[PDB]
Amino acid sequence: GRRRRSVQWCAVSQPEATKCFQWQRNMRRVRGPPVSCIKRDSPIQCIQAIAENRADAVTLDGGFIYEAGLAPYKLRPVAAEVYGTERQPRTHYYAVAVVKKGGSFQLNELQGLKSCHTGLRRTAGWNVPIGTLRPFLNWTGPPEPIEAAVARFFSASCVPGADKGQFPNLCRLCAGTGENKCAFSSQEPYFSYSGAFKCLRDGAGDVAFIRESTVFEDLSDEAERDEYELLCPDNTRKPVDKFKDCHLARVPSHAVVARSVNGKEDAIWNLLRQAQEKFGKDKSPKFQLFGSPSGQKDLLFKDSAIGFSRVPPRIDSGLYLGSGYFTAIQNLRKSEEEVAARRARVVWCAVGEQELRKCNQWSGLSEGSVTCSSASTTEDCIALVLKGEADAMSLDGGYVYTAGKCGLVPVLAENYKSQQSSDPDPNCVDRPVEGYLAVAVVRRSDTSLTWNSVKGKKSCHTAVDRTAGWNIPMGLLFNQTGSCKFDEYFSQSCAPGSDPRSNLCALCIGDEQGENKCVPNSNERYYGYTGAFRCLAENAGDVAFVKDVTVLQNTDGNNNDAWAKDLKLADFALLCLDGKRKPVTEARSCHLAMAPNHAVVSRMDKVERLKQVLLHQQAKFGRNGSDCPDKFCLFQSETKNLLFNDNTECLARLHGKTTYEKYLGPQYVAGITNLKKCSTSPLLEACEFLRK
Ligand SMILES: *C1O[C@H](CO)[C@@H](O)[C@H](O)[C@H]1NC(C)=O
Numbered sequence: 001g002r003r004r005r006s007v008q009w010c011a012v013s014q015p016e017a018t019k020c021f022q023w024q025r026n027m028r029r030v031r032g033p034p035v036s037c038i039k040r041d042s043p044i045q046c047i048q049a050i051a052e053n054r055a056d057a058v059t060l061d062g063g064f065i066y067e068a069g070l071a072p073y074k075l076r077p078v079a080a081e082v083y084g085t086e087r088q089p090r091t092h093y094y095a096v097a098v099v100k101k102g103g104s105f106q107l108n109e110l111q112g113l114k115s116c117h118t119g120l121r122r123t124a125g126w127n128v129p130i131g132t133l134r135p136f137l138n139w140t141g142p143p144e145p146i147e148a149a150v151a152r153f154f155s156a157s158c159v160p161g162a163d164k165g166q167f168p169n170l171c172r173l174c175a176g177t178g179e180n181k182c183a184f185s186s187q188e189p190y191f192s193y194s195g196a197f198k199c200l201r202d203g204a205g206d207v208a209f210i211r212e213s214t215v216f217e218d219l220s221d222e223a224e225r226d227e228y229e230l231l232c233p234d235n236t237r238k239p240v241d242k243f244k245d246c247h248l249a250r251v252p253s254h255a256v257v258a259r260s261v262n263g264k265e266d267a268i269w270n271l272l273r274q275a276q277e278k279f280g281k282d283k284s285p286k287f288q289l290f291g292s293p294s295g296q297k298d299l300l301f302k303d304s305a306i307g308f309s310r311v312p313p314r315i316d317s318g319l320y321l322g323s324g325y326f327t328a329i330q331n332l333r334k335s336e337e338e339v340a341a342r343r344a345r346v347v348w349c350a351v352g353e354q355e356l357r358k359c360n361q362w363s364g365l366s367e368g369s370v371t372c373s374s375a376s377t378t379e380d381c382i383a384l385v386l387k388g389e390a391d392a393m394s395l396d397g398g399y400v401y402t403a404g405k406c407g408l409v410p411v412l413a414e415n416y417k418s419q420q421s422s423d424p425d426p427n428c429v430d431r432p433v434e435g436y437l438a439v440a441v442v443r444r445s446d447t448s449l450t451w452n453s454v455k456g457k458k459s460c461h462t463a464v465d466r467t468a469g470w471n472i473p474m475g476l477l478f479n480q481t482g483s484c485k486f487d488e489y490f491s492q493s494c495a496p497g498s499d500p501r502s503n504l505c506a507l508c509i510g511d512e513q514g515e516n517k518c519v520p521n522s523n524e525r526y527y528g529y530t531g532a533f534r535c536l537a538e539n540a541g542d543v544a545f546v547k548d549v550t551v552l553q554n555t556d557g558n559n560n561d562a563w564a565k566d567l568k569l570a571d572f573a574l575l576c577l578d579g580k581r582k583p584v585t586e587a588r589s590c591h592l593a594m595a596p597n598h599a600v601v602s603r604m605d606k607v608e609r610l611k612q613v614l615l616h617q618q619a620k621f622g623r624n625g626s627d628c629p630d631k632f633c634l635f636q637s638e639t640k641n642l643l644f645n646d647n648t649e650c651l652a653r654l655h656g657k658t659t660y661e662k663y664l665g666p667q668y669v670a671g672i673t674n675l676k677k678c679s680t681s682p683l684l685e686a687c688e689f690l691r692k
């Protein structure tokens, strides 16, 4: 037969353990998957237990998801709590500031007042309120903890888990008896959402920092809910049911975490899917997964949560938290000077070592304004910008699709020499973009090869998901065949970013030492426009999917690299969609499609600053730049197209095309959306979940 010992759940107190044991027997009784219980005293202790295989799983507030994701622990959210109603379920909630009706004070008039918080380091109880209130605190920055600043700001507080000895003021309102006063557990009555609300009901505090549902969970009579109002960020008060218009932040729901390593994801999800169906929202009078004995609240999971939702594998704690909240958490340990220096600075994302070296030279010359981050794929760079770890990169239109689905926006586009219509152009920055031509290049010798007989031959691609190299040729082919089976369009290929064991990687050669085969960065010698052309010129493939200028740039002594030095434009032809073949110089009547210019993308929070930096930087290191070619040229890398295309004339403005749909256009977006039905990336799955 088989075996599965169990999933080891960490409880953080005794009533938790109690509920965890009674869950255990109800799983055995109903014959479902087994869960066993571990006991600790704190979230941190559960995070520790899990990282050293003494437990599998624990539910955590967003604040502790952040902690859990740091080294040495490296934990990952695997399942989100779902709130709302089965009609309108949601994996987020709202941090609100609740007050009694009858006072005049607003969110900016809180000094000297008394406060009720759920707990130190918690989302709604601490991180959001304290980050919102920051400009009123007169905090000097480290080494003095921000706690000291809030201790002087409110006259008295209950902040469970605060240091009663260092910050006695933060524990003064706490209703705990003895050593239980101000503790991070239910021994302290004013702990967590309901505890903080009770601190307000009792009149112990003037303000409670809680979630939007607390007043509805704890007050059944709707006439008693009227005695309460919300503080809105626009310095007004509004009724408690108007939380959507009146909240301090919208935040990700609590999540079950697990090891990133041998995490047991499947068993945890298997247990949770089963537990939820059998003991969920009023399913069994035997046991309520999301209920707590009338002594207590929120044991193991949030009371009245309605289920779980599985977190896609690509999501780590930072992606889970979102750029806003993730960077806001980090900012609580930083001075306002440091925070404002990071806003001023542009962190570039480099894909691979070669782009990293060039970005490093730019950085040194940028007068503090540009710095560098790096990853081994473009998707990984996109993730770094979502975590606010990097800010910017230039992307092929195919990747702009992915970036946009993830919420990033185009800011400036690569502009290229204008079809015999502009000069060495003073007005490049405002000249609207013209697109580039996607072409199918073949050898002249290959007289019998046409568009019509291209299926089954050997193919060279820039990378998977790029415009000229992938989306256009494969999109045209998909339009005939109907087949999602992309690895059978051609006998063999180099298509970087594909499965190394597939036919799509067969012709890739990897680096100078034969490592990194089929890797979607410049280490693979066949990567990108230049590498897909090379793949053809060295007889690896029979067709290369590139742009017209690529052939021009790599023939007739235009590229003096060993592989390229003796190639002639006349040895190459284009495949036209009408089955004819033409010279490269006739691309205008023999191209597969027009591709949108590569664009620099970023987060919405960086757009204006990014524009100032890039415009200033290109004035110095651009084509007509003051310090180019003397010191450094941004748009030069000897046919390697590092960071930008080498034929970029300038970075230009978008003229209203400020979203990916407007920039790429409705036709191109339809095409890719179609292609993506055949298979989506982890990152796209990840972004779907995060945008819900
Ligand atoms: C912070 O400085 C302001 C002066 O701009 C003052 O109103 C206030 O008393 C100071 N202290 C705190 C903790 O708000």
Ligand SMILES: *[C@@H]1O[C@H](CO)[C@@H](O)[C@H](O)[C@H]1NC(C)=O
Pocket: 479, 480
């Ligand atoms: C794709 O299919 C056909 C070829 O069968 C092509 O002519 C046409 O452009 C595409 N389909 C439609 C209906 O637009």
Ligand SMILES: [Fe+3]
Pocket: 061, 062, 122, 123, 124, 254
């Ligand atoms: Fe929370």
Ligand SMILES: [Fe+3]
Pocket: 396, 397, 466, 467, 468, 595, 598
């Ligand atoms: Fe491209």
